[PDB]
Amino acid sequence: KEVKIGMAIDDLRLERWQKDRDIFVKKAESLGAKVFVQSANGNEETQMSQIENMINRGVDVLVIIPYNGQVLSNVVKEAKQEGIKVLAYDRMINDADIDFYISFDNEKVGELQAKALVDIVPQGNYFLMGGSPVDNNAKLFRAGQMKVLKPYVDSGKIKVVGDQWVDGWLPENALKIMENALTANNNKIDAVVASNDATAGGAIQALSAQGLSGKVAISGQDADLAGIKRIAAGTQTMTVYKPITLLANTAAEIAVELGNGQEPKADTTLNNGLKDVPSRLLTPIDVNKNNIKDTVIKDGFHKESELHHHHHH
């Protein structure tokens, strides 16, 4: 049985997404499946059209990384009435009749970011820099972050001096937000709770412009090559490493199982507003100055030859 798989993704701007695409496809093809991948360029109407096109071409399974997780209910109904199975990849699709969800433990990611900051800045002014306002995961990171932060806020040790979501998870948007926040607070910010590496990068540039980079604690996520370099350089505090290989291989297995009418095993269910979605959650890894070698280098996520490769000479 050749399963046909349509993979509908948000974009390829964050370093991880090319690896999610490449590992997923390779494994799906190794499992005998045929895969068609499309990117929305972060446009919800492009994403709907692409999904609808996949449905019309007769895929057995849709695998979707939603740009906006709240506007896909109808297109999921279109899939279901044709007997197509739907896997939400990395980000929950809300209020939709989907069959399965796979991701990391996203609340835990948030906890790790906040904890690494309170360890070194237990008193001060905190700014909360979330991700895309239409990415369910952004809310999960925020929840995790505040689970750690709330006792400190309550006791008066920590003051939250600002919170903004970063549209599209875009470094440019993150730079501007940090620039304004710095202006509004007279550069009186001690820690930045950035929700991923790409946004941390923008923030770091605005912090540098005020002579504050290396002095303000700042969290992250994804262990992008550039993030690892920032961490080693002392300008980024930490990142949260999530082994893409594990997510993508497991997602490909689940997709093929779904395509054959099999029911994949779940760790738990998560309610998306419509139903309790069977779901699997992988373990994220705290990464800093002192465990780069033992995590990303050892796993081959970023080999030392990649870390040392000259890009411009």
Ligand X SMILES: O[C@@H]1[C@@H](O)[C@H](O)OC[C@H]1O
Binding site for ligand X (CB under 6 A): 14, 16, 90-91, 131, 135, 137, 169, 196, 221-222
Closer residue to ligand X in complex, CB, 107/222 = 222
Q: Is the dihedral of CA 45, 169, 39, 278 positive or negative?
A: negative
Nearer to ligand X, 99 or 135 (CB): 135
Please, what is the minimum distance in Å from the beta carbon of residue 42 to ligand X?
11
Instruction: Return the number of other C-beta atoms located less than 10 Å from residue 129's C-beta.
Output: 25
Q: Which residue has the tokens 């492009």?
A: 46
Confirm if 113 and 143 have CB atoms less than 8 A apart.
Answer: no
Helix (H) or strand (E) holding 9, with range, is strand 4-9
The pairing of strands 85-89 and 100-104 is parallel
- In the complex, the smallest distance separating the C-beta of residue 135 from ligand X, rounded to whole angstroms, is 5
> Smallest distance from the beta carbon of 14 to ligand X, in angstroms?
5
Decide if 31 contacts 253 (C-beta within 8 A): yes
Please provide the DSSP assignment of 119-163 as one string. HH-SSEEEEEEE--TT-HHHHHHHHHHHHHHHHHHHTTSEEEEEE
**Nearer to ligand X (CB atom), residue 68 or residue 221:** 221
Q: Compare residues 196 and 237 and give the one whose CB is closer to ligand X.
A: 196
Q: How far is the CB of 109 from ligand X (least distance, A)?
A: 8
Query: Which two structure tokens, joined as six digits, stand for 1?
Result: 């049985």
Beta bridge partners of 126: 160, 191
Amino acid at 237: T
For the chain, the C-alpha Rg in angstroms (whole number) is: 20
Shortest distance, position 40 Cβ to ligand X, whole Å: 14
| Cross-strand pairs, 270 | 277
| Shortest distance, position 271 Cβ to ligand X, whole Å | 19
Residue with smaller CB distance to ligand X, 46 or 53: 46
How many Å apart are CA 111 and CA 138, to the nearest integer?
Answer: 13
User: What is residue 94's DSSP assignment?
Assistant: P
Residue 33 or 177 with smaller CB distance to ligand X: 177
Which lies closer to ligand X via its Cβ, residue 20 or residue 60? 20
Two structure tokens written together for 33:
């499946």
Task: Report, in Å, the least distance between residue 240 CB and ligand X.
Answer: 8
